[model samples]
Structure formats: structure tokens, C-alpha cells
Target: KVFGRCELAAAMKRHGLDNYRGYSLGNWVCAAKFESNFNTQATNRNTDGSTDYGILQINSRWWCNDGRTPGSRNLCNIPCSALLSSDITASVNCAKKIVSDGNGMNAWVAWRNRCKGTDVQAWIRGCRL
Candidate 1:
């Protein structure tokens, strides 16, 4: 999908962040917290594997196919939408894209940032930038 960060914010709003029911949003945030601690522009060298970068910690090798470097490009194949969208959902969907790429938390966490919160409202609001 060609989804962007703004789209991801919309998806977060539609999905909500977390509730006492099943801890869905909490679960995601927990993973994110462990991975990036809400810092969308984070990176780490994995002794277990390879280099990680971004909120969802996208591997620089995988997403950085366009001459982009980790931390430099926010450790992602950040689409034009990520820079173009005036909504936080642009980043949200961007995160979705990273996650869907099979990189999982390792990659996704690399790019995650502090702007988002564990709560659904705040998390979705992150794309407003």
C-alpha cells in the first residue's frame, strides 16, 4: 500500500489507541515504547542481527533503497507524503507500512518518536505535524 503518515493517523483514530478490553493499543504502544520510546527517529545496531532505524525501527538496508541513510532519512523509505502531509496520520500510515513490511518491531521502533502517546487520541494526533 502507498499509505502515508497522515493516513496512519486516520487509521489510529478509527482504531483508537487502547482500552481495558484487550490492550490492543497498549500492546502496540508497549512494543513501540520498548523499541523507540516514542522517538520516531531512533536507531540501534543489533548484535542479534542487523542495523535498525526509525519509529517502527525500519532496517536501513531494507527501506533505505533510495540512497537514504539511517537517522538521515529517519531510517525509513519515508514517502513524499511523510514530508507533504499536514496530518499526523501520514506518519501513522508510514509506521503501518514499516510494520507491514515484515520488519516487525525491530524496524518500526527505529523511527518512532516521542510525539505520540500510548493513548489512542494522542497517538493518532501525532500525524497532525
Candidate 2:
């Protein structure tokens, strides 16, 4: 499923990502926009022999187990496919866990390179929360 910009803002708020972990909704939304362009089925294979899955691009190496990534830890204890579902509950949940990590949103390199320290207000500006 491809989410309209504000549609995704609503979903993120419903899932309690509004100011989650002291980060604004725009921060998450902007990162999502770049990471997957709001597409649920988005995926990327990593050079480290892992894969990034779903909206927030949860990785196979430390988060979910794809059963094929070498040395996977499954900290989120979910199948990597769960992140690919149209229902983003699994993606949101795993994302929360990722934020809880020491690296914070830096867990998503896209967030670091694209969303960090930027003016992300436009990402959620027109949305009614």
C-alpha cells in the first residue's frame, strides 16, 4: 500500500509516533518518505549481507530474522516479512524498538543522512493531528 502524505501522518499519530521518543512526527514521517516513499512493500538489500524491510526499513541483521541473513539476532523477534505487510503495526512496533536502541533514529541510515537536523515541518505541516 502506498500512503498519501497526510494519510501516513494520521497513521503515525494513531500508532503513537507523534513526538515519540522526543522526536517529532515530521521527523519520522520525513524519514519514512525517503526510506520507502510511503510504500508498504519497500525493501532494500544491504551490502552487509542483510536486508531492510518495510516502511521504516527494519533491518534483517539485528532486528528481524529472515532466516537467511547470517548472524541475525531477531531482537524484534518478528519475521522480516511482517514488516512488508500493508498493515503497518509490525513496522511501527519494530520502529519503536529501534528508537529505543542506543543509536536512536540513527538506526535508519536514511534518517541520519536525510532527516537529521533538517527542517521537517513540511513533512507533517498540513496534516490535522
Candidate 3:
């Protein structure tokens, strides 16, 4: 789905990402913007043969089972395809697990490169829970 920032903010808020793991709502919003542009079907393949899935770009190497990545962890215990839906609950849950697993919001390169150390408030401006 192509999401406007406010709508995506509202969506993530419903899933408990507002200040989740001490990361700002903007952090996730900014990361999502860069990673997937809020599109649920977003997927990116890494150089290691692993692919990233969904809005947050969870990696097949360590998270979802894509039936391709070698030595895959499937840590989220879900299929990569499951993450690529409009519902977003599954992806949000998996993202929470990623943060709980000690990765925090730094799991995505897009987060670190674009969201981190940046004023991401614009990503969520006029949208609050």
C-alpha cells in the first residue's frame, strides 16, 4: 500500500510502535519511508543471497523463512510472504521481536543511514497517538 505519512503513523501507532523500545515513532516512520516507502510488498535482496521483506525489511537471513537464504534463522518464526501484506500486524509484531531481541531499531540499514541522528519528526508530523 502506498501510505501517506499520517496514515502510516496512525497504523504503526495502533501496533504499539509509538516510542517502542525507546525509539521514537519518527524513527520507525523514517526508516519505513527509506526502506519501503510504506509499501507492504516492498522487498530488497542483499548481497549475501538473503532478502528483506515487508515494510521494515526484515531479513531472511535472520528473521523470516524465505525458503532461500542459507543458514536462515527464521527467528520471527514466520514466512517472508506473510510479512508482505496490507494488514501490517504481522510485520509490526516481527519488528517488535527484532527490537526485543536486542537489535533495537538499528536492525535496518535504512534506519541507521536515513533515520538515525536525523530529525525524523517530519516523518510523523501532525500524526500522534
Candidate 4:
């Protein structure tokens, strides 16, 4: 689904992602950009035989389940496809659970590789949220 940055910022802010569970909106937006370019339907296969799902690129191994992927604990107890919808409620909820683990955005490789220690304000520069 197509979404403007402003729209995404607005939605995320409204959903409490701006600072949810102590994670900055900047880190979240930065990760979202690199993970899926903010596309909810984004999916990618990882080198480790796992797949990433949705905007935050949640992993199949510890989070959601995709019947085809083995070793999924489905800690969130939700289908992987549930995260692939334009509506980010499920994705956001799952992400919150992930960050609550004390890892914060570190749970997502994108955050560590790109968002961490970087100038993330660019992700929401003129969004006016």
C-alpha cells in the first residue's frame, strides 16, 4: 500500500509509536524506512533461512508464524500475514512486545545497522507531526 511519510508519522504518533515503550519515533521511522520502506506488505528472505515480515521486518523465528517457516515460536501468537496489512495495529503491537524484551529496537537488525547512532531526524524531517 502507498503511504506518504507524513501519513506514516501521523499514524505512528497517534498509535503511540512516537515514544512507545521508550523507543524514539526517529528510530522506529528510520528502521521502517530501511526495513520495508514503510510498505506493510514487504517481505524478504534472510540469508539464515528465515523471512522478515511487514513494516518493522519482524522475524519469523521468534515472533509471528508463517506456516512455511520452521522454528517459529510465534511469541506474539499471531499469523505473520497479520503484520502484512496496511493497518499497522498488529505490527505495532508486535513491535511493542518485541521492544519490551529489553532489546528495544535492537531486536531489529535494521535499527542496529542503519538507525542506531545515526541522524534519524531525517526520517521525519518535514512530516510536521
15: Cα error in model 2, Å: 0.5
With candidate 3 superimposed using the best TM-score fit, by how many Å does residue 95's alpha carbon deviate from the native?
A: 0.4
lDDT (C-alpha, whole model) for all candidates: 0.45, 0.91, 0.88, 0.86
Candidate 3 weakest lDDT stretch, 10 residues? 120-129
lDDT, model 2, position 26: 93
Sort every candidate by lDDT, greatest first: 2, 3, 4, 1
Candidate 2: give the clashing pairs: none
User: Which wins on TM-score, candidate 1 or candidate 2?
Assistant: 2
Model 1 TM-score on a 0 to 1 scale: 0.40
Per-residue CA lDDT of candidate 2, range 4-116, in tens?
Answer: 98999999999999889999999999999999999999989989899999998888999999988999999999999999998999999988988998888987788899999
What are the root-mean-square deviations of the candidates from the true structure over C-alphas?
9.0, 0.8, 1.2, 1.3
Q: After superposition, which runs of candidate 1 have C-alpha atoms over 4 Å from their true positions? A: 1-23, 47-50, 65-91, 101-129
Answer with 3 or 4, whichever has the higher TM-score: 3
Q: Candidate 3 residues 15-113, lDDT tens each?
A: 899888888888888988999988999998989999999888899999899998999989889999999998999999999989898767777888888
Best by lDDT: 2
- What is candidate 4's lDDT per residue for 1-129, written digit by digit as tens? 756777888888888888787766787888888889889999999877778899889989899999877777999999999999989999988988899988778888878998899988788888877
- Local accuracy of candidate 1 as per-residue lDDT tens digits, 35-58: 655455566766544455444444
Best TM-score among the predictions, by candidate number: 2
**TM-score ranking, best first:** 2, 3, 4, 1
Model 2 earns a TM-score of 0.96
Supply the global lDDT for candidate 2.
0.91
Score residue 105 of candidate 3 by CA lDDT: 78
